[PDB]
Symmetry: D2
Subunit: 319 residues, 4 copies
């Protein structure tokens, strides 16, 4: 039976015997995402070039996501990549959830018409205290739901919650997300590696060794294929679907990595873990780092379990 | 004030005093690219998943049928077809179109950028059409371009006057001209190639890549980016500048990419944008084919980046 | 704040402390309707005219399938099917839905507005589901409404709390709420019926019409509009006020529009919008169905206009 | 096997050996009609309703106007929406005068019924500096005319000297597909269309005619009646399914209410080219010499035999 994202989430809420606050939050985020998809695809640019005689996309996506999340009456703290401070929703529109999100990841690459996406992660406010940004600083392990939408050749939403990962595809002709892959699990070992090899001179010796093992295999197996789109969502998605490892490791220029923790690392780490994968900083699992700044960055090496173990072994070999 | 692809192509056709045949051909190609864009975006998959109770094949069919219908073609060479398709006599015209309907079709599962590459040579031969009519060097190209289905659908069309990028507005289904007489940056900052095959790279491309991560003059290293979809990687080179290399690595030491419908369109585009495209040994538009599916090595990009590659190449010959 | 048909129905759902059966049924209906809208706007037909080489059945199938799949229906009565469909025991829920999948389908050739009409009852008996659960008088409706595919697509949804109108934004696949707690004008200035039947009208309606063209006093005449598809005509009546009439006539002694999925849904919308709907002899919402495809007379619209019809009607009984 | 509007129009420009200017005008108009259909269908209303935190017929006029000036094919543009004729800037002038109603019946849009765009195109017949007088040509001199109906699907009906051709917009690729070729009207239909409020003000010929239509003298079946109140929807149903449309003169002007240059003449032209008729009661609509760009005219149009039947009872009350 076809199932849409909306009929799936609603039914899952019924099983969960929830009041419907998270379901609203999610039905809101699903509209924000169709609107961002529509804009990314440039529906309307004829008007910008004077067919009849606008905001930069990342400003617009931040506004659509934030406006729909406030109007859901399910949020109290929202953290966005675009905003230096956590937004505390006005009491009238308050609910119990905290939402960390990256509205248009890889937006830099839009001029080059590169895949771009939206990352989000949902924490329940654990405090009984008046909402402050101290409610967003929860470890990834405490996530209720997390996921991403990827605006590629087609638009796909991947939604991860305690039951697992489910992929959903947008049909633009009717504005519905159809369930196309349920209970997605990742390849145990894959054949591809992703990292920006441009930083070769600033790489950590353990990273340096791991790539070489993939280029010139000791046991003279097939060399691993290289791929690096440079937009996190395109890269974790291909890693989920096909398997392999994605690395955005700590390199000398940026000792804590470059990728932000709450809205890029923890959502992706949670997807990867619920699909049978792993995500590690090198030292710990990404989902266990306890955040001290809502915009804190983390190293991330994530992907197919065997491949992350192999990296972790060359890593442990340099302690 | 607005120009659409249709008004541009019709107007250029007028300036050139053409019979209207190449104009009818480019229009058919435009409709095909929109129909492929809608199908790449999965418009209608709810009907597959049973709401009311192949894509690369579809793309090939859409292009084939539209081109035949244009009454502008005599020989059609496709990536999906082992032999050149010769048009029925009634539907014949003077042009030869070589096209890869959906480059990177593998990647559609990972929803990675996909594209339609195409080249148009005029049939100069007096004879009845045959596969040999597709064996003309890229230097004999009348027009070429691609359509990328990346985060938005953009068509890049290059003809004698220069390159022009067009943005598809899906709402009204119209390609609006967004960039005229495009010229690529002289030097770029990104190098693109699959470093997995490092084990099989001839010493010159190995030395080239090293000079990009550890620069002799102490500049900053180039960034690395590799979609693994030629159209995607060449459009980022066209727009952001840089160099793209699918060299002959020992595993497939003739290159991978095909000359008639992959390398020569992107090469023609690069030359009309002020760029360069080489096999290392010679310029890609000049290598005369022996086989419609002949592979070639190709290195293309900003003039000073491709010039830099040629210098380490010649320092190994 | 924007409110969409999805966010609005959820909230009504939580206020009503429902189990979510009806919310799932209304979510299902929403999807079906955006799918029928696309099919009506002829999306994809290029494919049929060979770009690469009956609308009501597809509409019946989209509403039928989305409804069995909601797990909330147990008896479905469509205009298309001669018998009430009984849902399969695994897929049963408590609601009984009567619907006309693409009302006005006969005029789609002439590109006339078309729409979908639905009513939702709640099964009353504990017996095995049968055609008899569908036979409840209109007064017992939990919700009812229609979707008009006109110059834009609109869904009007009446529930006990009131009538609300939603507009489809086709760029994002969302029904945005544009009018909330609609109420109809008390007296209108448009009368709507097929005056071609004049030879067969009973004297009450023949007097009533003459009374609108030649006012017995000296009011301006009422203007006349008859699009010819109930959804288009009753939607104009709701928005602009007036009266719509499709009475019995000798050839249709019992009327022509069907009680269960045409008259009762519109009567419920009229009545919750502060309007009236009558057969002439009794309110449409109070007649008891004996058969599912039963015909009935209906005059509906602004309260003052319908009352003035009822006075000339009773003057001839 | 498709032929699109772009291909049909281009192939036809080539056969007629034109310079290509009429082809640029007609191409420009096709885009403007697709831009309007998107707007009519409410694509984007979420932004107006604040998803991120009449104007429709003024926008329609802006889309048609700016697309035709840029075609470089026009020199005088007469719009319903504008009091005076627009003269094109000397550097963008071509040889065509276009008369158009950019969104016909945009009163019915609240109620969401069918609205449409109507146009007729003329060639400038004199050497003089362009003026409103260039637009003052009887419809007999039209080069091409048509309309676009934004009904349940969007359709463009184009009528040129060779015939009337109906094209359907596939919105999923924005392409007008030729769905029917060289269209001909039925000789006689079974629908009559007019607003019967005016019964009080109807002159005796149309009162007699409509009466013969509901109480048919020869005891045949009576005609059905339909009236949408948007001329595009009403004339289109008349083309497609046959019958008669009337919007006659009465005390609300002895001259009718619809307009000659951009409502009457385009539909009168399409009607004749589909094998139908269009009269003012006295002269064929395509022959009345206009003297003002917003001049009104009575119009009865439709199947040949039906218009001929009205002319018989019209002539009876003179
Ligand atoms: N739609 C949903 N799908 C998954 N679980 C949900 C759903 N809605 C609510 N639940 C769960 O029930 C708890 C309370 O939900 P709620 O009452 O809606 O705020 C949440 O923390 C969720 O984990
Ligand atoms: N639309 C076009 N834009 C660019 N040049 C064209 C155009 N159409 C034709 N010409 C030129 O004229 C030659 C013959 O065109 P034709 O006779 O129309 O098929 C072409 O091969 C082009 O070099
Ligand atoms: N979404 C809703 N809109 C308004 N009424 C509702 C809704 N959901 C539940 N109801 C009311 O509560 C009753 C039980 O609904 P339910 O248990 O979900 O099937 C229905 O018959 C309605 O009268
Ligand atoms: N696309 C076409 N369809 C049919 N007739 C055309 C078309 N293009 C040109 N014509 C005819 O040729 C004449 C001269 O063409 P032009 O020089 O472009 O204005 C026009 O006034 C028309 O009568």
């Amino acid at each position: 039976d076809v199932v849409t994202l909306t009929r799936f989430v609603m039914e899952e809420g019924r099983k969960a015997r929830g009041t419907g606050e998270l379901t609203q939050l999610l039905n809101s985020l699903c509209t924000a995402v169709k609107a961002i998809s529509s804009a990314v695809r440039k529906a309307g640019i004829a008007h910008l070039y004077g067919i009849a005689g606008v905001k930069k996309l990342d400003v617009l996506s931040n506004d659509l996501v934030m406006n729909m999340l406030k109007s859901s009456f399910a949020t109290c703290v929202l953290v966005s990549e675009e905003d230096k401070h956590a937004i505390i929703v006005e009491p009238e529109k308050r609910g119990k959830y905290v939402v960390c999100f990256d509205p248009l990841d890889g937006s830099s690459n839009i001029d080059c018409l590169v895949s771009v996406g939206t990352i989000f992660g949902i924490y329940r406010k654990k405090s009984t205290d008046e909402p402050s940004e101290k409610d967003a600083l929860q470890p990834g392990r405490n996530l209720v739901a997390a996921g991403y939408a990827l605006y590629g050749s087609a638009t796909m939403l991947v939604l991860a919650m305690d039951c697992g990962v489910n992929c959903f595809m947008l049909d633009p002709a009717i504005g519905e997300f159809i369930l196309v892959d349920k209970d997605v699990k990742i390849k145990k070992k894959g054949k591809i590696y992703s990292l920006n090899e441009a930083y070769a001179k600033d790489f950590d010796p353990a990273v340096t060794e791991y790539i070489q093992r993939k280029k010139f295999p000791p046991d003279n197996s097939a060399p691993y294929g290289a791929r690096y789109v440079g937009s996190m969502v395109a890269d974790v998605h291909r890693t989920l679907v096909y398997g392999g490892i994605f690395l955005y490791p700590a390199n000398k220029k940026s000792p804590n990595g470059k990728l932000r923790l709450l809205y890029e690392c923890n959502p992706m780490a949670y997807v990867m873990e619920k699909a049978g994968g792993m995500a590690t900083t090198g030292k710990e699992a990404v989902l266990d780092v306890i955040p001290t700044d809502i915009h804190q960055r983390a190293p991330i090496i994530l992907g197919s379990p065997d491949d992350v173990l192999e990296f972790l072994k060359v890593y442990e070999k340099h302690s």
